[PDB]
Amino acid sequence: RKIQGGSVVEMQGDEMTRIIWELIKEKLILPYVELDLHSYDLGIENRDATNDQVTKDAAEAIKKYNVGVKCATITPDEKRVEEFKLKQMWKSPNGTIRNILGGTVFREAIICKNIPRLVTGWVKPIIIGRHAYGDQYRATDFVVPGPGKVEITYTPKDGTQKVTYMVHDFEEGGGVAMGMYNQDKSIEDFAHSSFQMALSKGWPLYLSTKNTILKKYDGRFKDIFQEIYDKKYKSQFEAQKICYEHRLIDDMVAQAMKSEGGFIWACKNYDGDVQSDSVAQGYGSLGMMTSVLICPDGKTVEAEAAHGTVTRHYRMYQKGQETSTNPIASIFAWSRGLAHRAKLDNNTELSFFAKALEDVCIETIEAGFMTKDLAACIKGLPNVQRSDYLNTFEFMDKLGENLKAKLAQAKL
Amino acid sequence: KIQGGSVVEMQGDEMTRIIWELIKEKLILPYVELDLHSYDLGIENRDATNDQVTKDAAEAIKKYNVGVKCATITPDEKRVEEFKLKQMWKSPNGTIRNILGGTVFREAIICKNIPRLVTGWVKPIIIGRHAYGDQYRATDFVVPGPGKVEITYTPKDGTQKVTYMVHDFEEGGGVAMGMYNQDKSIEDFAHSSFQMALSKGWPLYLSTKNTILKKYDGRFKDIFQEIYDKKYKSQFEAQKICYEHRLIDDMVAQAMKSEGGFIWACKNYDGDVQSDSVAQGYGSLGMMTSVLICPDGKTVEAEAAHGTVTRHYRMYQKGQETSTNPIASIFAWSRGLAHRAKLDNNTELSFFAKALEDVCIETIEAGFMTKDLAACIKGLPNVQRSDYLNTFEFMDKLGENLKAKLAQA
Ligand SMILES: NC(=O)c1ccc[n+]([C@@H]2O[C@H](COP(=O)([O-])OP(=O)(O)OC[C@H]3O[C@@H](n4cnc5c(N)ncnc54)[C@H](OP(=O)(O)O)[C@@H]3O)[C@@H](O)[C@H]2O)c1
Ligand SMILES: NC(=O)c1ccc[n+]([C@@H]2O[C@H](COP(=O)([O-])OP(=O)(O)OC[C@H]3O[C@@H](n4cnc5c(N)ncnc54)[C@H](OP(=O)(O)O)[C@@H]3O)[C@@H](O)[C@H]2O)c1
């Protein structure tokens, strides 16, 4: 009989990842695990259909059952509005889910011994702790239509002084403007998650900001981290002989590039987004990275691929060009989500299944069966033959065969 | 000595200040006579003049069209205490760029014997960094407690004011900020980017986060596309190159895995961050050029992209030997003087500028380099003192080779 897995919130997505997502459920999950699957279609059409209510409903469900596994989703701009005949330019479902749940998105490469990196020195893992709240991802932006002043105003609840700051006086023509923000409590949760992750790994921690330029905004991050360190984690850090350091983002990305890895990197929301993809590509592929939102309650997680819907491959798929999209990141959303589900329930069999799922992925790749992106890592793109890799369906089938075999052995 | 002409010089801070004088003393003035308009943008003098020296320097560049700037300290609270400053002064770079406008073009300085950290970059990556607006001319503040932050637009013509909610802080405080950009600046940004692509013969990529900042970043995307479809597309096809917008996180990955050989138009912030990422990728922050090209097509400001290298300066203060790479600071002068030459049809200064650059590359390729470059070759753990020269040892070697090169031609 199948493993009794419990309640998991599933969020279906878009385009190429939507296709892969179904193959994963059919070939790797459902045959072995029976889940109370709370499914929410976060495909762009359904979101438009529900006026994005389905996205909010999914986030609330994650609060209830403590485990979310999410497929990559289209975040629409004008072109997407035209493409799907949308009612509105809906906000990022990820931004909405993260805004509701809070926490830190931890991202890390998935490493195979036979895959060369683009960055020579990274023999140890780099873990990015991405602050999941605020800044650009909950901003209020608009087009400035012509000459006029933009100002930003603070009005305290407590009737004290109201303050108006000049943003810019557009003397001729227009442009754009935006306001963005963050909250002390969220920054504090972010700091705590960062120090704790470093202590659990036994690695140094770095925070990057641009506090020289955003003296107040980014200065707040810097101050809160330092304060929380001096009060809560300093002695613990000293005991494990690791350090915490603040660096300017400029300096930090250069430092990361030349390091050997083996550190925790606390990033502001935007930096965490951009640099996690830089790092993932650095180790080999966007297809080879885990991403898990760890919420402040220490119980709730949302696992996801860090990459998008892989539109370009999807276009190929729509035109019958054979595709070779890497499913590993999407598979690890399931394994990481199921592993947490297992941990909460002390579900030994589910834990075993989740690790076995990950082992199958690594073993299969290390045995020389891989998608084109990984084959490109080994051979270099110009040297890649069709014989060097498997197409998307072939690779999924190969994983399914290897998983079946591995789970069959273990039972014997 | 060569008669250079009028150049605006800006002195800086810490390690780069030292190097800056070494450069002038050995590599420039011994060969070039300059109408040198010097401004001390050191932290001490900026404080002394209430940062007026920085604005004066900017106006000077506009007048004489050539500026060469040394790296400067941008003060935060720690700098305020360290130097007992009157105020937390704004970045002199931000101030200068805000006045001059333009695009900061950044690119690695390549030596054949220096291994990269990124295996695939056999061709160069040129970043065009929009030098105006966004985070670098923003208004930020601490939110002291519960309350609402709103952003408002008041039309100049007296029509209806518009107010947007930024955030209602219901519990505790936080931070907030407003930032902006201008259509004309974005347009100049676009033009400078397409033109650079065409002059280099390479494809052009613009990165934004327009899926998230739909209005703000969408404007950048729309302005680039419009200008492309109307002035540069035909030329692009004719050179068999192309323009493409990408989301920033896609772009950084694409860049990481590419062979190089493209122009990368970045918003101010991305240009800042990714230029350091790329410089380090090719080998060293010390090995990158940075040139602000102003929208008038005649004014230029050259600089090092890296900072004042405070950590090396700290060792220097404690008497320890330092090995800081001067090449970027040297190229600030060479790029500045080279532009000065093009302006004045000065064929003898153009030669000197090129000669200064060739001497740097020749010397490094001959096995004489600072510790950072030696670490590229051997690996940091395997570097020994015999593998490199200290800052002053290296500057002297450059001094000799320069003179010989000039003599021979
Ligand atoms: N977490 C999320 O829900 C999320 C995150 C990012 C983007 N998105 C959305 O996804 C859509 C497409 O965005 P995008 O094209 O900028 O980024 P993307 O979907 O991540 O893909 C961009 C490029 O990255 C490479 N790539 C990403 N995942 C890959 C994989 N699994 N296997 C092999 N290669 C992979 C491919 O490179 P090559 O083309 O060179 O082969 C692909 O064309 C957009 O609508 C965006 O809003 C969603
Ligand atoms: N253009 C500018 O005026 C500008 C730009 C950036 C920063 N800054 C200012 O500079 C100060 C220090 O900033 P920061 O320490 O974050 O950055 P930084 O001075 O650029 O460099 C920090 C690290 O980068 C490496 N590095 C940079 N330039 C180098 C060179 N020429 N040769 C060898 N190594 C080099 C060193 O690495 P290792 O320690 O590993 O040896 C150094 O410790 C700050 O006050 C900042 O405001 C100014």
Author numbering:
A (entry chain A): 3 to 414
B (entry chain B): 4 to 412
What do the authors of the reporting publication say about this deposited model?
The native IDH structure without Cd2+ does not have strong density for the cation, but it does include density corresponding to two water molecules that are hydrogen bonded at the position of the cation. One water molecule interacts with D275, D279, and R109, while the other water molecule bridges A308 and D252 of the other subunit. There is no such electron density in the native crystal structure without Cd2+. In the crystal structure, the cofactor NADP+ is found at the crevice between large and small subunits. NADP+ remained bound to the protein after protein purification. NADP+ in one subunit (molecule A) in the crystal structure has full occupancy, while that in the other subunit (molecule B) shows low occupancy.
